[PDB]
Amino acid sequence: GSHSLRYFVTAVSRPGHGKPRYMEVGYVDDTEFVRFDSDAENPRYEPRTPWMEQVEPEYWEGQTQIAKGNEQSSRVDLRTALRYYNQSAGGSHTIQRMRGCEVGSDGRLLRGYQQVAYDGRDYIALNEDLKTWTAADMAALITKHKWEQAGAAERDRAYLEGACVEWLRRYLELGNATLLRTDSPKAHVTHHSRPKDKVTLRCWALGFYPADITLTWQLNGEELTQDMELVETRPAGDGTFQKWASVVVPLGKEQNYTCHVYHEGLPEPLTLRW
């Protein structure tokens, strides 16, 4: 498969109410594994999975120091943006950054990411070539120039192609048991009679990982789109995911509809009927 290591950074100003709130979150493959929270009684990077607890203590202190530098920086950034955009004082504003690498099963870099949003909108992003920037606006053009002049892109390229990839591997081998597992969905169909002569068929998928799944309903032998609902895929909170798709069909015609569940952890897709 392909895997990714990703860092998500949030800074939120709260004028009058003290210094900005600041957070960093690390993800391996969409599992949260490290976190830095300024609200902590004693803020610092900490492990978020049992498997992260086995790394050298040298690991943490260093990363904590890096996060603290990021937090002081981000506080300056919030002030900077207010100035670039000429925004009124006294409101809350947010900076977000995502940076990470996505690597194919051959250990090669498929993609490196470096991007920033201000107040929830694209601000600046490192292009796929890992050498040039895309500024979303006038304000971001000032950062683009600063960053070119400071040789930021090359610092980022080096990290994304080297360290980012190298640590992904440590982490993968570290959380071995649980990161690479597959839990296939357990499926079933429920049945409900609504007004007039309608029946709701709900096709359920539970306890699966990874999150990626497809559920479809077929009438006679082709898929449906109207009379259908599917909920966004959701965490059970224990590392598995849930989804369902329902369809409304005529009463006494339930037997003509089948539900199909597609998931990598299945020797082949599931077919259910009421």
Partner: peptide, 8 residues
């Protein structure tokens, strides 16, 4: 591993 971020 996280790195340090460039100022805006």
């Amino acid at each position: 591993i996280q790195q340090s971020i460039e100022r805006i």
